[PDB]
Structure formats: structure tokens, C-alpha cells
């Protein structure tokens, strides 16, 4: 798996309606293989065309949480859905709270062609 398809798998769901339901995260986190061996604690899906998320790599430059100098923040607040692990979850019975919202994203991009290689955070600046 390349450092780009895994991003699509873990964070991309272009054509899915924005207003996620209470099954989405429990469903999607399962289908996208983030609950194998261990429950992926937190994950965010983006409801936008890959090309839209890909352009952020050329949009505003910003610093990543870790401190590396090469992250990017999108121009517009994209329609995303946050999935939060419940404090009652016990593998393999991963359980998530689904939270759909509109926020800008901060991704890390690398390689050639230049593309997203890590979903860093979402921002509420609007």
C-alpha cells in the first residue's frame, strides 16, 4: 500500500453524504480496516473530491503537530466526519461516536507527485 492510497482508505469518502448517521463510523472504521488487531482511536473522513483534498498540498503551508516544517491547511472548511472511540470500547468490539461537521483540514504532503500522506487535524476558524 502506497503513501497515498492508505490516505484515501483511512480518510477519503468523497461521494458519501455529509450528514453522517450513527452507523457511519462504526461501519466505515470497520470497512476501511482501522479496527484490525487494535481499534484505531480517532479517525476523520473527508466528504470531498480527491482533487479537492489534493490541492491543499499546494494551498496554505503550515506546521504539523509534531513540529516538522511541511504541512498544509485547506482554503475552505471541508465537510468531514469525526469518529471518536467510546471509553467503553473493548477490542474487537470497537465502538465510535460519529460527528459530522464542516472544518478546514491540515494534512501533510510528500513525494512526487506531491500528495497527502497524513491527516493532521481539522480547524474551526469560521
Amino acid at each position: 500500500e502506497s503513501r497515498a492510497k492508505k490516505f484515501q482508505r483511512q480518510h477519503m469518502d468523497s461521494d458519501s453524504s455529509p450528514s453522517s448517521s450513527s452507523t457511519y463510523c462504526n461501519q466505515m472504521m470497520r470497512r476501511r480496516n482501522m479496527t484490525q488487531g487494535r481499534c484505531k482511536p480517532v479517525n476523520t473522513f473527508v466528504h470531498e473530491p480527491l482533487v479537492d483534498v489534493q490541492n491543499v498540498c499546494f494551498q496554505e503551508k503550515v506546521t504539523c503537530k509534531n513540529g516538522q516544517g511541511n504541512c498544509y491547511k485547506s482554503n475552505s472548511s471541508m465537510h468531514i466526519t469525526d469518529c471518536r472511540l467510546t471509553n467503553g470500547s473493548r477490542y474487537p468490539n470497537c465502538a465510535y461516536r460519529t460527528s459530522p461537521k464542516e472544518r478546514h483540514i491540515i494534512v501533510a504532503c510528500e513525494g512526487s507527485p506531491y500528495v497527502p500522506v497524513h491527516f493532521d487535524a481539522s480547524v474551526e476558524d469560521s
Binding site: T23, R30, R31, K40, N66, N87, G88
Partner: protein, 460 residues
């Protein structure tokens, strides 16, 4: 002779060709699970026919498929062959409604071998549930395990369920989580358990609007079922008072509860003192979750004192997101180096920083330590405290699983962890690193370590 086959597909689109290909297995498998396989009401006819001729089927799991009320009906008809012996059956998240409960109710009266039912994630409502309860009350119903999480049930469902508990001496487990049955309903379900001769093994009523006063109802339960092994009451504003009134039951000599789930129940430091009294007294309490409770550094101090005293034999302590700071870490270091009963410490979502983590590493690094699993996700850890973790993995040899997901870790930090796990002397068997940003170099460097040591799984 003996021929046992099992199939368990999950989240897979099934072609028609591949489907007919699997039908012979449906006729042959004792264990079948087609979880989220896009099954349609239509396709519930192939399953119906195939199961009708499977004199082996003991477990059927159709979780997360749009079977609808008609689909489930077709699947239940398949279990009508005289020689069927299904012991387990799940219809979780299958779009079943109250309009399907009549069929299931009349189906349960004819499956004496059926022992486990999961109806969670379906909108049953009170009328459907009440209707089912009639089927469950049949002497031919030998159900011992039933899960009804998120079934749109309210307080108007507990009297019906209480009657079932009274009619099943063989009952083992009931789960009603995520149903606002309120204070009375909870008081009514517990009433059943009390009378009922069934030695309940596990009770789960999380996110059920269980109240402080109910902590008195549950008291009578803990102090009445020597068989009770698991009690889950998470996500209920129980309170410190609530905790207090629970102890009399837990502290009962006959109580042998092994697992207590109380995450997000309105408990603080004062409620800790209450639980510590139970920990130190009951060597039977092995697993404990206090995740999402405002225990504070004073709550961890209290828990840590008891974990350092002879008595308590807790094995797993789950205290993620409890609002602890580095100030409470010198203590956990000692427990990880002086405790011979704790094998897992979920301490995620705590601002322990590099200072606190380093202390933890000091205790685990002491020879003699026994801890097996450590969860340090989102504890504000960076490259600073990473050299320690790398050396601890070479000094301590009991740890088998380490979770550092969702932190600040850097490429210099991971490299250090790698330089330790890649060695034949480090016996760590699982490293989990979700949501972390390393370089394209590290990726391949990580992907190399894989092949160089397949006994170590690096989950990300």
C-alpha cells in the same frame, strides 16, 4: 469421524458467482458469519434453503446487512428443519423493527437449542420487545444470553424483561445498554434478577439513565449473585454517593465480580477511596475501568497506594482520559516495578508529558517488573522521552504490547524505538502507532523492520 468447517466474511461485496460458490458452505458450516456482506432480502432465500439442509449449523451471525423484516423472516424460516441445532444467532444492525418481532417471537418457541441472541442496533421499540418477551416466556425457549443494546427500549420494557428473568433459571447474560429505561425501569429489571433463581453471569446497563439511587438497586444485585462475573454500568452519572452504596455489595464476602465497568459515571477522588476499599478487600476483582472519570492526581494517588499494598489483585487498570498529570507518575513507576499482578495499564489521554512518561519507563525498566500491556496514547509524548522507551524495551522483557498512537512523536523518536525492537533481544510483540507523522524514509525503514521480524506487528 469429525468434520468442522467455518466461514466468517466481513465487509465484502459478494458476486453472484461467488455466492453460489459459498452456498455449499452454508449447507456445511457449523459457524457462519457474513458481517456487512450486502446481503439482501432476496439473498436471504438462498441462506434459508441452505441452512434448511445444514444438520451442523451451531452459530449464525448476519450482523450489519439490510435484511429488513422480510429478510429476517426468510432466514428464521430456514432454522425450522427438525435437525437444526443453532446455539448462537446474531441479527445485530439488520434493520429489524417491531413489525418483525411477531415472527421472531413465534420462532423462539421452536429453537430449544438456541442459547444466545443479539438484537442490538435495530429499532424494536417497546411493543416489539414486549411481543418478543411472550415468545421468550415459552418453556421451550432456553435462551441464556440476550443483547438488546440500542433497541429503542424505554422504561416500558423492563417489566416484560423482568418476567423473562423470572422464567429462566438458566439465564447467564443480559445487556440493555443504550436504552433510556430510566430509574424505574432499572429498578424493575433488578427486581426480576433478585427474585429470579438465575445465577446471572454478566449484567450490562451502560448509557441507560441508571441513577444514583439505582446504585442502591444494583447494590442488592451485587450482594445476591455469587455467579456475577461482569457488571457494566458505564456512561451513567452514578456519582461518588452512587459508588458508596455499591461497595456494600462488592465488599460482600460472597461477591466474586471479576470485571467492573464504570467509565464516565460521575466519580471523583472521594469515590476512589470508596473503590480502593473494595480493591484491597476483594482479590476477586481483576479488571477495572475508570476511564473518563475526574479522578485527578489525587484519585491516582489513592488507587496507587492500594496497588502498592498487599491485598488487591487487580490485573488490568483502565484509566484513560482521567485527567492525570506528570505529578502522579512517580507512583505508577513504582507500581510497574513493585507490582506482581498488573499486566495491563490503559493510561491514554492523560497529559503525562515526557516527564511523566519517563517516570513510567523508570519503573518498568526495573528488573522484576511484570507489566504486559501499556497504553500511552495521546499523553503528550514526543521524541524527548523516546530514548527511554527504546531502552526500556531492551531492559524490561515482560512487555508484549505498547500503544503510543496519537502523540507528538518524531522521526528521531521512532528511529530510537526501532533501534530497540529490531533487535532479537527485545521481546515486544505488538507496537501500535495510529495517527503519527514520520518521513517517507521512516515508512520504508518501518516496512523493513516488519520483514526482519514478523513476530512484531506494527499497527498503524
Amino acid at each position: 469421524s469429525l468434520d468442522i468447517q467455518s466461514l466468517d466474511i466481513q465487509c465484502e461485496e459478494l458476486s453472484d458467482a461467488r455466492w453460489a460458490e459459498l452456498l455449499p458452505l452454508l449447507q456445511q458450516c457449523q459457524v457462519v458469519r457474513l458481517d456487512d456482506c450486502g446481503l439482501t432480502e432476496a439473498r436471504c432465500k438462498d441462506i434459508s434453503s441452505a441452512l434448511r439442509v445444514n444438520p451442523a449449523l451451531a452459530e449464525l451471525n448476519l450482523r450489519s446487512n439490510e435484511l429488513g423484516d422480510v429478510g429476517v423472516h426468510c432466514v428464521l424460516q430456514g432454522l425450522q428443519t427438525p435437525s437444526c441445532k443453532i446455539q448462537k444467532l446474531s441479527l445485530q444492525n439488520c434493520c429489524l423493527t417491531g413489525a418483525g418481532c411477531g415472527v421472531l417471537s413465534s420462532t423462539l418457541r421452536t429453537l430449544p437449542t438456541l442459547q444466545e441472541l443479539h438484537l442490538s442496533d435495530n429499532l424494536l421499540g417497546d411493543a416489539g420487545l414486549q411481543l418478543l418477551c411472550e415468545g421468550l416466556l415459552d418453556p421451550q425457549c432456553r435462551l441464556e444470553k440476550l443483547q438488546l443494546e440500542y433497541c429503542s427500549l424505554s422504561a416500558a420494557s423492563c417489566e416484560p424483561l423482568a418476567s423473562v428473568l423470572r422464567a429462566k433459571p438458566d439465564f447467564k447474560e443480559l445487556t440493555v445498554s443504550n436504552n433510556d429505561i430510566n430509574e424505574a425501569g432499572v429498578r424493575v429489571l433488578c427486581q426480576g434478577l433478585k427474585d429470579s433463581p438465575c445465577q446471572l453471569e454478566a449484567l450490562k446497563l451502560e448509557s441507560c439513565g441508571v441513577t444514583s439511587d439505582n446504585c442502591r438497586d444494583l447494590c442488592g444485585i451485587v450482594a445476591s449473585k455469587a455467579s456475577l462475573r461482569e457488571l457494566a454500568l458505564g456512561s451513567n452519572k452514578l456519582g461518588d454517593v452512587g459508588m458508596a452504596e455499591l461497595c456494600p455489595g462488592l465488599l460482600h464476602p460472597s461477591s466474586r465480580l471479576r470485571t467492573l465497568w464504570i467509565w464516565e459515571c460521575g466519580i471523583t477522588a472521594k469515590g476512589c477511596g470508596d473503590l480502593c476499599r473494595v480493591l484491597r478487600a476483594k482479590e476477586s476483582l481483576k479488571e477495572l475501568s475508570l476511564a473518563g472519570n475526574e479522578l485527578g492526581d489525587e484519585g491516582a494517588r489513592l488507587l496507587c497506594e492500594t496497588l502498592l499494598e498487599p491485598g488487591c489483585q487487580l490485573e488490568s487498570l483502565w484509566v484513560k482520559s482521567c485527567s492525570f498529570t506528570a505529578a502522579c507518575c512517580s507512583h505508577f513507576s513504582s507500581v510497574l516495578a513493585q507490582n506482581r499482578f498488573l499486566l495491563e495499564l490503559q493510561i491514554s489521554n492523560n497529559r503525562l508529558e515526557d516527564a511523566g512518561v519517563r517516570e513510567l519507563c523508570q519503573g518498568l525498566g526495573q528488573p522484576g517488573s511484570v507489566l504486559r500491556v501499556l497504553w500511552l496514547a495521546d499523553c503528550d509524548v514526543s521524541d524527548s522521552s523516546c530514548s527511554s522507551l527504546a531502552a526500556t524495551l531492551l531492559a524490561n522483557h515482560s512487555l508484549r504490547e505498547l500503544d503510543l498512537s496519537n502523540n507528538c512523536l518524531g522521526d528521531a523518536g521512532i528511529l530510537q524505538l526501532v533501534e530497540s525492537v529490531r533487535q532479537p533481544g527485545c521481546l515486544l510483540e505488538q507496537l501500535v502507532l495510529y495517527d503519527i507523522y514520520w518521513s517517507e524514509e521512516m515508512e520504508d525503514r518501518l516496512q523493513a523492520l516488519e520483514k526482519d521480524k514478523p513476530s512484531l506487528r506494527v499497527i498503524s
